[PDB]
Amino acid sequence: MIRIYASSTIGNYILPAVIARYRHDYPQLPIELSVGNSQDVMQAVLDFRVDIGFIEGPCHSTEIISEPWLEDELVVFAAPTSPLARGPVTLEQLAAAPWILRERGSGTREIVDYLLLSHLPKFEMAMELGNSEAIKHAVRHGLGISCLSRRVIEDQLQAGTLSEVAVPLPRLMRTLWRIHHRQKHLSNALRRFLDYCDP
Amino acid sequence: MIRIYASSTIGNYILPAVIARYRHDYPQLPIELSVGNSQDVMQAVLDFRVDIGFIEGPCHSTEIISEPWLEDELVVFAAPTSPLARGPVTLEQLAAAPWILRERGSGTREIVDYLLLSHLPKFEMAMELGNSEAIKHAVRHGLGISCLSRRVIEDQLQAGTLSEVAVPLPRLMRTLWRIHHRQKHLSNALRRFLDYCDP
Ligand SMILES: [Cl-]
């Protein structure tokens, strides 16, 4: 058995496709997938409740081995009617918009703070929401703007229900990490599953 | 300060739009929205941590007043390339399909069991997943089929990345409940917001 805990973007928008391909070739090797925020993953790995974790924030622990797995682009986005949805925008313009943020313990929250919000003037947090789908829909209906993985909003961007916002910074790139306990021995079955995770 | 706790279908797909219409008419009156599962909502109401809760399953407590708030259609869905997406299916074919289901004890699993799975001869669960978004991605990539609120799959049905299964069953309707503690009184500030939570 392979027991996995994954962060929100990874567990909801990546690993189900990987598991589908894996189960097709190994239909009699079970997999358990739990999804939470990156802090949830860390604690599950530290408690030896899962075999492997996947996180999307800089989570640190002397008891954890972290290995780079995938790149991931964070995207500032807004309702299509927002003035920010068209043309160049400045950091001061971003700081004047209502921001919708994830909860403490989200890797996305921490990375967005370092890569972007740390460079903004005083800005208002309009709402704090505990998952990325509530944020997507709050932004779609004009409650504010936010910043999430392109993977989370890709389908809305294509359908025109959300709009990407230009940011005067380099592409907001982060690493999606594979983690396991420093004292954990990875099974051959798991290492085989990780081959399906490799792009 | 109105403090809401809502299950995922309601908090992610219904209330964001409602809060928008409300804050547009009451910008000075704030709203705090927490999203989780129905059981999280129940405990938050019991612990007096929120003013009102919204749930999507038959959960019951003797300390709670529950009122039917909205009806909600459950829909069986599959990858567009699935044979089960092409024409009417039999109960036998549904019973043989790989089911992607929410965990036992959740409101969605209980109501899906009652309205759908209890009518199938000896179905098998291909995988258990803890939230609707992971389920959608799993089904989208062919891991199996599932049953969720039409509201939750609407965008993907429109995009054509998920397909509705033509099942030989009645239209499957569940209840979305509004709840509060039985000794709580709905303030006029909250009753006004609830007028915006009125179809
Ligand atoms: Cl019910």
Curated annotation (Swiss-Prot), chains A, B:
It comes from the Bacteria. Disulfide bonds: none annotated. GO terms for biological process: DNA-templated transcription; regulation of DNA-templated transcription. One of its GO terms (molecular function) is transcription cis-regulatory region binding. Keywords: DNA-binding, Transcription, Transcription regulation. Belongs to the LysR transcriptional regulatory family. This is Uncharacterized HTH-type transcriptional regulator YeiE. It comes from Escherichia coli (strain K12). The chain holds residues 91 to 288 of 293 of the full protein.
